[PDB]
Amino acid sequence: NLYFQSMSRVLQAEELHEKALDPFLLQAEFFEIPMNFVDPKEYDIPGLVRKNRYKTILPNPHSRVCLTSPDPDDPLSSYINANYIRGYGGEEKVYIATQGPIVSTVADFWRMVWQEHTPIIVMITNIEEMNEKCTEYWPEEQVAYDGVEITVQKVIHTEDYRLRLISLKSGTEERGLKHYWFTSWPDQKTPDRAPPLLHLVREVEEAAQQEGPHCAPIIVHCSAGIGRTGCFIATSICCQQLRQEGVVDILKTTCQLRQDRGGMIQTCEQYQFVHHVMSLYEKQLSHQ
Numbered sequence: 001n002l003y004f005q006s007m008s009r010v011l012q013a014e015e016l017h018e019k020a021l022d023p024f025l026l027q028a029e030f031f032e033i034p035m036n037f038v039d040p041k042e043y044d045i046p047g048l049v050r051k052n053r054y055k056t057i058l059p060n061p062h063s064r065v066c067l068t069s070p071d072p073d074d075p076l077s078s079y080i081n082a083n084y085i086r087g088y089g090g091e092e093k094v095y096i097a098t099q100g101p102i103v104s105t106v107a108d109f110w111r112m113v114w115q116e117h118t119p120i121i122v123m124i125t126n127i128e129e130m131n132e133k134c135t136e137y138w139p140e141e142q143v144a145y146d147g148v149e150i151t152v153q154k155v156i157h158t159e160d161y162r163l164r165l166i167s168l169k170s171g172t173e174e175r176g177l178k179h180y181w182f183t184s185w186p187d188q189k190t191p192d193r194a195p196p197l198l199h200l201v202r203e204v205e206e207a208a209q210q211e212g213p214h215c216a217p218i219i220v221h222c223s224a225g226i227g228r229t230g231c232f233i234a235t236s237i238c239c240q241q242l243r244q245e246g247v248v249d250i251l252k253t254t255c256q257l258r259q260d261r262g263g264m265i266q267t268c269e270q271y272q273f274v275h276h277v278m279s280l281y282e283k284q285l286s287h288q
């Protein structure tokens with residue numbers, strides 16, 4: 001409750017199924033949630049215009065990712081449109097929600113990946129979109145940014161995602177990276193379009209657990225780093241809540257996300273989609 005009073009609606013299975021199918025209540029509930037957007041006057045930095053894809057979608061100062069190398073004392077050099085996002089049970093820095101890199105921020109994005117020891121990147125797109133919403137920041141094979149060599153070792157093609165196994169090298173340091181390029185984000189967020197997002201969430205949870213204790217932040221991004229990014233993260237947190245508590249609180253999860261980054265889950269269609277995905281997961285989990 002740091003920036004606004006958080007709200008909550010603890011859903012048991014029956015109510016979850018019904019809530020996902022009540023668009024009138026879903027919109028009433030959604031549009032009561034504060035957006036917690038950042039006033040652009042909060043950042044007064046020469047050259048900042050080049051670092052943001054959208055003037056009104058900025059990182060909340062308290063949770064913004066600060067680029068510590070090569071000049072932590074220079075505001076421009078230390079800037080990236082990215083925020084640390086708490087995970088399930090308030091665990092700090094489980095994710096980093098960021099905008100899709102632009103031509104002027106590709107090198108900054110890789111500086112963040114390296115600084116944060118990021119083991120997984122989740123990129124959310126549709127086939128119809130191709131890559132008109134995000135600049136191709138990874139190489140065809142190899143590219144070097146600020147002493148860090150990025151090498152695409154393997155490309156795994158699945159029905160709803162392309163998984164790239166990437167190596168990051170700098171001096172005597174070598175690190176692995178898994179880049180999940182999800183291609184099944186739907187135009188119409190109907191319940192029949194929920195299974196591929198659920199599969200992606202479950203695949204990423206498994207990959208995250210396999211990193212072992214205190215997994216470094218997982219980078220999630222769409223274009224603005226709030227809408228689809230918000231859906232993916234809220235879904236991942238609620239899957240854990242369902243397994244552990246036997247309930248889902250999408251409303252509280254959304255409020256928690258908005259406290260970390262203004263605008264997380266941007267549309268009511270996206271909000272309803274999280275409910276469709278969670279309703280489906282509850283049905284699948286009921287069989288084990």
Ligand SMILES: C[C@H](N)Cc1cc(O)cc(C(F)(F)F)c1
Nearest residue numbers: 087094204205208209215218236
């Ligand atoms: C407990 C740790 N935070 C690791 C973790 C477990 C999990 O089940 C899902 C995630 C993810 F971030 F991907 F959602 C992460």
